[PDB]
Design a protein around this ligand. Structure first.
Ligand SMILES: *[C@@H]1O[C@H](CO)[C@@H](O[C@@H]2O[C@H](CO)[C@@H](O)[C@H](O)[C@H]2NC(C)=O)[C@H](O)[C@H]1NC(C)=O
Ligand SMILES: *[C@@H]1O[C@H](CO)[C@@H](O)[C@H](O)[C@H]1NC(C)=O
Ligand SMILES: *[C@@H]1O[C@H](CO)[C@@H](O)[C@H](O)[C@H]1NC(C)=O
Ligand SMILES: [Cu+2]
Ligand SMILES: [Cu+2]
Length: 381
């Protein structure tokens, strides 16, 4: 209804944000030349998956397949199940999952993760485009019918086949929250990732999968499963969710909407979309990058963060327009530990983003702006 229709208020926020980025890049380029790594000349825009041509979609799909057929950098002793460069990215996410969620590094870490995946597609696999994004609210009633997941030759593969199952149950550790099922739950049998082989994980057990060998870093080849449906997507990632997210006053409020409140009914669009993918390995937070769907999800997470950061450049807008480019927050998610359990120092801009064997490491500070450091991109509506 309301929540499944794109309000003009939201369309305007994306437009104001892109204009702020372009105006600021013009000025910054001139200031630097007067005495430049990113310019409005060099700026690329990541695109909405369904906006790409069939050829552009096919180029993306084939680059991903290429990365799944390139030999790994991860030593066999570190991850016996890593067979490919694609698996190298799964390995580092598995290794660091307990540190890089509900922590100060989460957004910066995942931004650089997506950038390094995109870079490997381009530099190692000859991809000529950029990482597309999953516009969550655009297909919320039926993501399995979208160009991302319709099972056509330009998709990332279809839904898992229907298998009767209950939605996931969140059990608070030392009341229970039952979430709605999608309309899949079995093996993906359509599109380019029909019968895709998943090598690593799961780290957790899933409904139909035992925890994988060597804590999910061993070799466990098995079919891709998904449980796409509108129930989780609609409930947790609609146009009202995105408008609420972009209108938050600071990073701690932003991330409370985005990442939810653990062991409550409000899981946020980040976990909402993870559960929307569901299946195997999407149901396992550790191994979630083992589904190509992960990357269009995290490109959207990055897009909403980068948009929100740019909205800070407007007149009040933040008094210090640099604030959203420097502020890692002061709340429960702003520390070097998951929800600050156990209590740990605040995340700092000087903190290392460790990409393990997958890719070069950097600092949080180096990735706070999509048009600074090595980064020169934004997003197109
Ligand atoms: C769109 O997303 C928002 C969450 O981002 C949903 O909001 C909540 O809905 C229930 C309504 O029954 C309330 O009890 C909660 O207080 C609301 N949560 C928040 C965080 O506002 C909204 O329901 C979603 N729309 C649809 C159609 O599911
Ligand atoms: C919560 O769910 C778990 C497993 O899903 C179950 O074993 C446990 O008993 C449940 N607790 C209650 C009070 O329902
Ligand atoms: C996928 O695997 C099934 C079950 O092994 C097989 O029968 C089917 O032909 C395969 N489909 C594709 C598109 O490869
Ligand atoms: Cu993650
Ligand atoms: Cu994630």
């Amino acid at each position: 209804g309301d929540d499944l229709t794109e309000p003009k208020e939201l369309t305007d926020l994306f437009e104001k944000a892109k204009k702020a980025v372009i105006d600021r890049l013009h000025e910054d380029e001139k200031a630097l030349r007067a005495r430049p790594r990113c310019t409005a000349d060099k700026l690329i825009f990541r695109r909405e998956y369904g906006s790409l041509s069939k050829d552009e979609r096919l180029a993306y799909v084939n680059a991903v397949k290429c990365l799944q057929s390139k030999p790994p950098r991860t030593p066999a002793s570190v991850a016996p199940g890593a067979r490919s460069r694609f698996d190298d990215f799964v390995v580092v996410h598995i290794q660091q999952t307990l540190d890089i969620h509900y922590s100060g590094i989460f957004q910066a870490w995942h931004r650089w993760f997506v950038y390094q995946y995109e870079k490997a597609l381009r530099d190692e696999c000859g991809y000529t485009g950029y990482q597309p994004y999953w516009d969550w609210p655009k297909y919320a009633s039926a993501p399995q019918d979208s160009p991302l997941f319709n099972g056509d030759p330009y998709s990332l593969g279809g839904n898992g086949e229907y298998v009767p199952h209950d939605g996931p149950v969140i059990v608070p550790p030392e009341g229970n929250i039952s979430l709605p099922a999608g309309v899949g739950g079995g093996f993906v049998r359509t599109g380019p990732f029909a019968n895709m082989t998943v090598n690593l994980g799961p780290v957790g057990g899933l409904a139909d999968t035992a925890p994988g060998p060597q804590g999910g870093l061993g070799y466990n080849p098995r079919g891709l499963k998904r449980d796409l449906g509108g129930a989780m997507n609609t409930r947790y990632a609609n146009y009202t969710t995105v408008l609420r997210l972009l209108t938050q006053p600071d990073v701690d409020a932003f991330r409370t909407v985005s990442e939810g409140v653990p062991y409550t009914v409000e899981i946020g669009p980040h976990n909402g979309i993870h559960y929307t993918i569901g299946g195997d390995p999407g149901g396992d937070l550790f191994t979630s990058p083992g589904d190509p769907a992960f990357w269009v999800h995290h490109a959207q997470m990055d897009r909403v963060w980068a948009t929100w950061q740019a909205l800070g450049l407007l007149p009040p807008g933040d008094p210090d327009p640099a604030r959203r480019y420097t502020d890692l927050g002061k709340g429960d998610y702003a520390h070097r530990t998951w929800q600050n359990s156990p209590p740990s120092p605040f995340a700092e801009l000087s903190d290392v983003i460790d990409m393990g064997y997958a890719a070069p490491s950097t600092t949080i500070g180096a990735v706070m702006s999509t048009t600074e450091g090595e980064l020169c991109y934004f997003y197109l509506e």
